[PDB]
């Protein structure tokens, strides 16, 4: 399918499309803002996703264990049940924990990879 | 602490709070020419660190050695004793130098590195 | 200037487990990297674990992969062991020691600079 | 582990040597050959760190040097407390961090 075909997908599907949404976010006075506003946001996107160790990839595994607290849901409701926009709407109020751990995880693989590389 | 708040702490100490600087750095004609010229910045940083090998993390360490003519003194003064204001200005009149042999180094080990895929 | 003082068990059966720890003072615990070392009753010394000093990276020897953890506590100035199995190649007085590692803005360690008096584990 | 000779022994006030021998991977690519001094029944006492260096605290009359694969530890002016067990420990890489020696007994 095309942009935001797989909207109304399961969660499972919808993340074989992600190249699809990927490629359409980027594709006088007011129009220059809005133009500008759109990188600015691009920008902080690929920003948090450096941040986290996920530069260069659409799916990206980390090592932050989920907190049962977020979800309670097993992953046969979530991946074969769900849409992402209901998933979007049930963890909402937990977004900005979940990016915090991230970025902690992140913080501490840098400084263990940099002390592995100092053993001669 | 928050944003700059470790710019008079140690060279060690500050290397801690890389995110928080980081994640600053994004967050009518005169105005658009203010942002798109720190997006433009902040491109050709991220440009520079694509080329170093390092595009993808805050900290990277390299294959170039330090010269010592750039700096004489021990890690024990420069990480403990030091703070990064100094040390930007101590080593200011050496960072073109820097660059110039990060790039060569990033440049033969990409061509070692296909040369290294092309055995079967 | 520095003590290191290492507490633990007495006699343990093979298939058993056994924790050590080591206390230590005189110095800042969360800036050296600690290790455990061996020596059997009869022989001379053997390295067993290393662990750094913000306790994300445990090495170990072979032998002990599969039996022995390593952890630290900077809070409570503690480094830990926990054994398990214990075979009887395993007797000997444990030592902890500060050094062995240094964490890339720190000059170069390579040798155990501070010695506990140890404790002797049978098995 | 490295070999060491089974014993060393001299007269006071002379110099005598304790060699430890290793192989190309280990004292011969790495600058890192610790010697410890373990009096009997005591912990061991750091005498020598990296090749030629030594900690503070530690008196002029215990040195060493590498050459090759070998490494040795000189001690000279031998006294009547210098009786102990040395040990030579060098750093072997990132798989095999620490390689002793078997005792020296002085």
């Known amino acids: 399918d095309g942009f935001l075909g797989a909207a109304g997908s399961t969660m499972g599907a919808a993340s074989m499309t992600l190249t699809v949404q990927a490629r359409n976010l980027l594709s006088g006075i007011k129009q220059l803002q809005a133009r500008v506003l759109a990188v600015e946001h691009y920008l902080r996107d690929q920003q948090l996703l450096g941040i986290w160790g996920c530069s260069g990839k659409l799916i990206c595994c980390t090592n932050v264990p989920w907190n049962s607290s977020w979800s309670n849901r097993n992953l046969s409701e979530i991946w074969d049940n769900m849409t992402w926009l209901q998933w979007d709407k049930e963890i909402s109020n937990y977004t900005q924990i979940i990016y915090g751990l991230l970025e902690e995880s992140q913080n501490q693989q840098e400084k263990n990879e940099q002390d592995l590389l100092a053993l001669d | 602490d928050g944003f700059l708040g470790a710019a008079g702490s140690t060279m060690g100490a500050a290397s801690m709070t890389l995110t928080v600087q980081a994640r600053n750095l994004l967050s009518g004609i005169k105005q658009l020419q203010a942002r798109v010229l720190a997006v433009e910045h902040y491109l050709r940083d991220q440009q520079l660190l694509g080329i170093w090998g390092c595009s993808g993390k805050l900290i990277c360490c390299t294959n170039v050695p330090w010269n010592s003519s750039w700096s004489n003194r021990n890690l024990s003064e420069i990480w403990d004793n030091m703070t990064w204001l100094q040390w930007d200005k101590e080593i200011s009149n050496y960072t073109q130098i820097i660059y110039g042999l990060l790039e060569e180094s990033q440049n033969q080990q990409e061509k070692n590195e296909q040369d290294l895929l092309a055995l079967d | 200037e520095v003590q290191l003082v290492e507490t633990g068990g007495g006699l343990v059966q093979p298939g058993g487990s056994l924790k050590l720890s080591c206390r230590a003072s005189?110095?800042?615990?969360?800036?050296?990297?600690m290790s455990w070392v061996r020596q059997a009753p009869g022989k001379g010394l053997e390295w067993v674990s290393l662990?750094?000093?913000?306790?994300?990276?445990?090495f170990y020897v072979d032998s002990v992969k599969g039996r022995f953890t390593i952890s630290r506590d900077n809070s409570k100035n503690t480094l830990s062991l926990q054994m398990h199995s214990l075979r009887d190649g395993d007797t000997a007085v444990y030592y902890c020691?500060?050094?062995?590692?240094?964490?890339?803005?720190?000059?170069?360690?390579?040798?155990?600079?501070?010695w506990g008096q140890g404790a002797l584990v049978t098995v | 582990a490295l070999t060491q000779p089974p014993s060393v022994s001299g007269s006071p006030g002379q110099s005598v040597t304790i060699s430890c021998t290793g192989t190309?991977?280990?004292?011969?690519?790495?600058?890192?050959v610790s010697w410890y001094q373990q009096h009997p029944g005591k912990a061991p006492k750091l005498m020598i760190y990296?090749?030629?260096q030594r900690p503070s605290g530690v008196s002029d009359r215990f040195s060493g040097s590498k050459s090759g694969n070998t490494a040795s530890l000189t001690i000279s002016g031998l006294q009547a407390d210098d009786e102990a067990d040395y040990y030579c420990?060098?750093?072997?890489?990132?798989?095999?961090?620490?390689?002793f020696g078997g005792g020296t007994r002085l």
């Open positions: 020691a500060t050094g062995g590692m240094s964490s890339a803005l720190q000059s170069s360690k390579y040798y155990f600079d501070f």
């Open positions: 005189g110095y800042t615990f969360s800036s050296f990297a």
């Open positions: 662990i750094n000093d913000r306790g994300g990276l445990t």
């Open positions: 190309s991977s280990d004292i011969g690519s790495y600058n890192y």
């Open positions: 990296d090749v030629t």
């Open positions: 420990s060098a750093y072997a890489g990132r798989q095999t961090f620490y390689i």
